[PDB]
RNA sequence: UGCCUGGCGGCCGUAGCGCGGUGGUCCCACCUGACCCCAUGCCGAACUCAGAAGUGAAACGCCGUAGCGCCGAUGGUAGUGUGGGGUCUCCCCAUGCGAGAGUAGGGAACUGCCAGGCA
RNA sequence: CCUCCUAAAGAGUAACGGAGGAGCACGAAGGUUGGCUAAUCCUGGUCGGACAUCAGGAGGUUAGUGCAAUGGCAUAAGCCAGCUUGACUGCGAGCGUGACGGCGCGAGCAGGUGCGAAAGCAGGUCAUAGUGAUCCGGUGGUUCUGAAUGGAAGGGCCAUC
RNA sequence: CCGACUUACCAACCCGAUGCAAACUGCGAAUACCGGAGAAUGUUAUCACGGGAGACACACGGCGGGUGCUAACGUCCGUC
RNA sequence: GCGGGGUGGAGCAGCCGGUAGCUCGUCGGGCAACCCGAAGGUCGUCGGUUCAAAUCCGGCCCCCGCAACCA
């Protein structure tokens, strides 16, 4: 992988109102707050 | 045609020169190249000059 | 190879008159003046040459260098005829006189 | 009665100057051609205009070789 | 590499029992993820391509390769030798991490979401899907974005055909509807 | 199709060298081993060969796929070549970029006294 | 009238007409009209024979024309000496012996012979009637 | 000495496609990691290095199979050199050469050098 | 002046015969080293639709060649990048083509250089058109000559307009 | 929507069958031409150098052709 | 027989490989003169080249300047 051309990429914690916590990498830098998580989406849950 | 003939004068100070062509419109920059010069016998840098 | 320009042709390009026939009629009537004197339609307009044109009731004097055979939009006509500052002042003087008359 | 044709170019004397089995001195032009119709093989050089010339004395020889079945000229040394 | 070890432990055996494969690597695998757009409206301004490139530098985690006009098309007013979009290819740690981002955060985030078609598989096991909006991704922000934009996501899988493709994505729990 | 691509890129130097008619030192590179041969101008007969698959060289080396192994096989082929009396060859890149283990092979053969 | 929709070259050399024909065997139908001598059949001749046959059979049998005019023949206008090749006037098909000119199916042999006899009078070359052969 | 594998060739479709099957001790391939030698007009895809956990899936090799490709007679036909002739825009005759297409058919390559694993 | 056919399977071959181009372009569009392979079609995919870019498959050069056509081109002569000026100086075994003037191809030798680790390649471009004799003068270098001698003017040789 | 409904119907590519080409060729002669070896024959018939020219308006016929109307005792080429 | 032209209702550049515009005519608005906005071609017709024809080539229709002369 090339040296210094690419944007900064780092481990970041992502949080959601549903409350699960998972480790993920992104270029965003500051912590991420999500309206909908995967485990709380109605279709993925199968409830609706 | 549009290309105008020019002389590449040896920088060795021996007066030898080459003749080539170029067009002034697209490439207004000076032409400079390392070409052989028989009288001094060495590869010396030639700069263009008027014909 | 400069292309010669007629006086009525220049006027028609400048849009002063609706048609070249009207330009010829006005020139032949003596109302139009070139260099402040009566002139025939055959006369040639020249760059930096005064055109003491008389249109309607207000005089104009232009010395424009850009002469165009082709009639242009009025936005271009403003550039086509120069309308020097003295001519502007004289035109506004004539306009004020007309307003006083009215 | 005017015609737009009547124009042609002088013929260029192409073709095979030396045919198979002919003894040629070094440097003799073997074939003059447009494009590498005959390719360069052993002891044969290809000039800039795709002419082929013997690089050594011997007997010229045509043959068919290679996956493309192209013709090759080579000087059997002698 | 959470999806990487997901694949290594349990998706591999799930697919192996489900299709009765003799050799382990016979299970289909996801070789690469490719993101690309047609920015054909870059013929008006060159700079808008730079914004596209920066946006997906942020989205993908690597500097996009600009794409090139393959050949002239007059009907679209483009001639050969013009940049008309960008692309980014993701493999390995990045390919998994982006897949994780997709499944976890992106696929919830599309408005009016009713599913993702199962008919989008090409026919040789490689899946394709189109993303209309970029705000769905966490990295891109709504306030500083320039214009509504989209992209396409292609996943390439050594899978031989459609059913092994859908089985792979189902085992990874990719939504389908 | 790595093999076909490699043969394609090697063919130009291959046929140019065949045209010159010089003795050709061919190198093969593989993730596990590395082979070397010295082929006469006609391209048929092989004069001297040496590879890390051979038990003679294999048991000295820790691993047969590394640059040190490449250097050892290079020294071996050079010694065999000097024994038979070739003393000069033309290297065959063989589509392998002149770098890494092939590069080490070339340097080992050069230091061994083989002129190329 | 039959004419090529497009051609690479507007004018073509006169050429010659040696050799025997190809496509001698009737192939597309039950009956056919052969040629016995060399000739140059114009598009007008083709059209005239076509009309004669079609009307003779009264739109019952299906018709095939195995010759197409594709050689442009030029003619100088009157009162000219030299000065380049003349304009194209009509198109012709070169015919050698054996060339099945026309072919018919779906009609009794007797009426087929009648129609072909009527049409052969419009052509310049001698013709004969030939039937389908299994091989 | 026999089988199998890798490289380098000879030859350039009887030798190449398609379809089915088979191979992992050695060899090959895929494959694990890549901060570094090296590289991505992004990507360890390619190239490159460090290795040997798994496998023969893909590729590769090998065996079989005419759905193709390909090769291809004998006979006739076309053409034509020389001489003669006719009803001379075209033919014919003696003699020499003799196609192309098509038919019967052949066909799933053969082979040299070196190295390695097994018996 | 160049390409094709007429042109009759070596070369050559006329017509107020049939058809098209030239009077350039390029210090990179040259040299070398390394790398790569097209058109077209099908399927899937946001704007995007017949044709934009992405992925895969079929196909195998039907693409591309700076400009006409022919002949070439996968070892690529096609496309990309790094470094560079061999678009060098003096010669030239031999040969092609012309009545001649001339035009063309050229391994190799010497000096020096570029690329390549090296083998090697490079004396312009894929080739064939992109041209102008002699005279008369112009410019720079070189005592070669210099109408008594020493210089100069002019002339000469080389480069060049 | 798919599934297809008849045409006033038009149908691209592909497939099967039949032709045509000077500027089409995945095939391909007879002749001619270049070279090599061999016997017979031929007044060196061949090449080079030198002295002297003439000639550079051709015609018809056979064969292969362009133009013409496969007209001309027409015109322009190739070979005899 | 040789060359030119065929472009909003009329007159016109362009245009001459790179998405059709100007004046007048019409309408409306500003204001007889003058200024602004809009509808208005599908480039004489049919084919070919090109990634693409107002553009470039072949043929066809009409109109224009010419010559169709010496015997």
List the helices and strands and how they pair.
This is part of a larger assembly, with 7 protein chains of 7 kinds.
Chain B: E1 4-10, E2 17-22, E3 32-36, E4 43-49
Antiparallel strand pairs in B: 1-2, 1-4, 3-4
Chain C: H1 7-14, H2 20-28, E1 33-34, E2 37-38, E3 51-55, E4 58-62, H3 74-80, H4 85-101
Antiparallel strand pairs in C: 1-2, 3-4
Helix pairs in contact in C: 1-2
Chain G: E1 31-35, E2 39-42, H1 43-57, E3 62-65, E4 71-74, E5 88-95, E6 102-105, H2 109-120, E7 127-131
Antiparallel strand pairs in G: 1-6, 1-7, 2-5, 3-6, 4-5
Helix pairs in contact in G: 1-2
The structure holds 4 RNA strands.
Helical/strand content category of chain G:
alpha+beta
Helical/strand content category of chain A: mainly beta
CATH superfamily of chain G: Ribosomal protein L16/L10
The strand line-up of the biggest sheet of chain A is: 2-1-3
User: Order of strands side by side in the largest beta sheet of chain G?
Assistant: 3-6-1-7
- What is the highest CATH level, the class of chain G? Alpha Beta
Q: Determine the CATH topology of chain G.
A: Aldehyde Oxidoreductase, domain 3
Note the quaternary state here: part of a larger assembly
Beta percentage of chain A is 25-35%
CATH architecture designation of chain G = Alpha-Beta Complex
Helix-strand sequence of chain G: EEHEEEEHE
Pfam families (chain G): Ribosomal_L16
Protein name (chain G): Large ribosomal subunit protein uL16
GO molecular function (chain G): rRNA binding; structural constituent of ribosome; tRNA binding
Modified residues ((3R)-3-hydroxyarginine) (chain G): 81
Task: Explain this structure.
This is part of a larger assembly, with 7 protein chains of 7 kinds. With 48 residues, chain A is mostly beta strands. Chain A is built from 1 helix and 3 strands, in the order βββα. In chain A, a hairpin with a 4-residue loop joins strand 1 and strand 2. Chain C has one domain. Chain C contains 4 helices and 4 strands. In chain C, a hairpin with a 2-residue loop joins strand 3 (51-55) and strand 4 (58-62). Chain D has one domain. Chain D is built from no helices and 8 strands. In chain D, strands 1-3-6-5 form a 4-stranded antiparallel beta sheet, with no helix packed on it. A 4-stranded mixed beta sheet of chain D has the order 2-7-8-4, with no helix packed on it. Chain A binds chain E through residues 1-2, 5-7, 9, 14, 22-28, 32, 34-38, 41, 43-44, and chain E through 2, 57-58, 61-63, 97, 100-101, 103-105, 107-109, 113, 115, 138-139, 175, 177. Chain E binds 4 RNA strands through strand 1, strand 2, strand 3, strand 4 and strand 5.
């Amino acid at each position: 992988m090339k040296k210094d051309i690419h944007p900064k990429y780092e481990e970041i914690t992502a949080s959601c109102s549903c409350g699960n916590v998972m480790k993920i990498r992104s270029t965003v830098g500051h912590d991420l707050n999500l309206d909908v998580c995967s485990k709380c989406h109605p279709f993925f849950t199968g409830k609706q | 045609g549009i290309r105008e003939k020019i002389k590449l004068v040896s920088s060795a100070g021996t007066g030898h020169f080459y003749t080539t062509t170029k067009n002034k419109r697209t490439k207004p920059e000076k032409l400079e190249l390392k070409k052989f010069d028989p009288v001094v016998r060495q590869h010396v840098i030639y700069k263009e000059a008027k014909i | 190879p400069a292309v010669e320009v007629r006086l009525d042709k220049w006027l028609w390009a400048a849009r002063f008159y609706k048609t070249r026939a009207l330009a010829r009629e006005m020139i032949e009537g003596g109302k139009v003046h070139y260099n402040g004197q009566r002139s025939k339609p055959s006369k040639i307009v020249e760059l930096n040459a005064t055109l003491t044109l008389r249109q309607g009731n207000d005089e104009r004097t232009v010395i424009v260098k850009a002469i165009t055979e082709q009639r242009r939009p009025a936005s271009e006509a403003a550039l086509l005829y120069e309308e020097t500052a003295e001519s502007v002042e004289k035109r506004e003087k004539m306009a004020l006189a007309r307003k006083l008359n009215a | 009665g005017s015609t737009r044709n009547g124009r042609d170019s002088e013929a260029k004397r192409l073709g095979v100057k030396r045919f198979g089995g002919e003894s040629v001195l070094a440097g003799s032009i073997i074939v003059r051609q447009r494009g590498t119709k005959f390719h360069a093989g052993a002891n044969v050089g290809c000039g800039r205009d795709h002419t082929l010339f013997a690089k050594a004395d011997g007997k010229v020889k045509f043959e068919v070789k290679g996956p493309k079945n192209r013709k090759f000229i080579s000087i059997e040394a002698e | 590499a959470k999806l990487h070890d997901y694949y290594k432990d349990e998706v591999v055996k799930k697919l192996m029992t489900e299709f009765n494969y003799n050799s382990v690597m016979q299970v289909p695998r996801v070789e690469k993820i490719t993101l690309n757009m047609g920015v054909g409206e870059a013929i008006a301004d060159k700079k808008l391509l730079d914004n596209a490139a920066a946006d997906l530098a942020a989205i993908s985690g690597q500097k996009p390769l600009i794409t090139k006009a393959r050949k002239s098309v007059a009907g679209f007013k483009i001639r050969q030798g013009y940049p008309i979009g960008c692309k980014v290819t993701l493999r390995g740690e990045r390919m998994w991490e982006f897949f994780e981002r997709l499944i976890t955060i992106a696929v919830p985030r599309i408005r009016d979401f009713r599913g993702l078609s199962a008919k989008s598989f090409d026919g040789r096991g490689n899946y394709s899907m189109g993303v209309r909006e970029q705000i769905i991704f966490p990295e891109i922000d709504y306030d500083k974005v320039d214009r509504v934009r989209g992209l396409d996501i292609t996943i390439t899988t050594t899978a031989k055909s459609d059913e092994e493709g859908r089985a792979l994505l189902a085992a990874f729990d990719f939504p389908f509807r | 199709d790595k093999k076909s691509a490699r043969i394609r890129r090697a063919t130009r130097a291959r046929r140019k060298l065949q045209e010159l008619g010089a003795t050709r030192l061919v190198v093969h590179r593989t993730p596990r081993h590395i082979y070397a041969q010295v082929i006469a101008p006609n391209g048929s007969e092989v004069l001297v060969a040496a590879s890390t698959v051979e038990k003679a060289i294999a048991e000295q080396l820790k691993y047969t796929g590394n640059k040190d192994a490449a250097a050892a096989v290079g020294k071996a082929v050079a010694e065999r070549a000097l024994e038979k009396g070739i003393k000069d060859v033309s290297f065959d890149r063989s589509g392998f970029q002149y770098h890494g283990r092939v590069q080490a092979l070339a340097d080992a053969a050069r230091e061994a006294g083989l002129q190329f | 009238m039959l004419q090529p929709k497009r051609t690479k070259f507007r004018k073509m050399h006169k050429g010659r007409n040696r050799g025997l024909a190809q496509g001698t065997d009737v192939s597309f139908g039950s009956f056919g009209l052969k040629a016995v001598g060399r000739g140059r059949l114009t598009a007008r001749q083709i059209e005239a024979a076509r009309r004669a046959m079609t009307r003779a059979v009264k739109r019952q049998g299906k018709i095939w024309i195995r010759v197409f005019p594709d050689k442009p023949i030029t003619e100088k206008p009157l009162a000219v000496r030299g000065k380049g090749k003349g304009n194209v006037e009509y198109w012709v098909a070169l015919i050698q012996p054996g060339k099945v000119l026309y072919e018919m199916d779906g009609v009794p042999e007797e009426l087929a012979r009648e129609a072909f006899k009527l049409a052969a009078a419009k052509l310049p070359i001698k013709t004969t009637f030939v039937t389908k052969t299994v091989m």
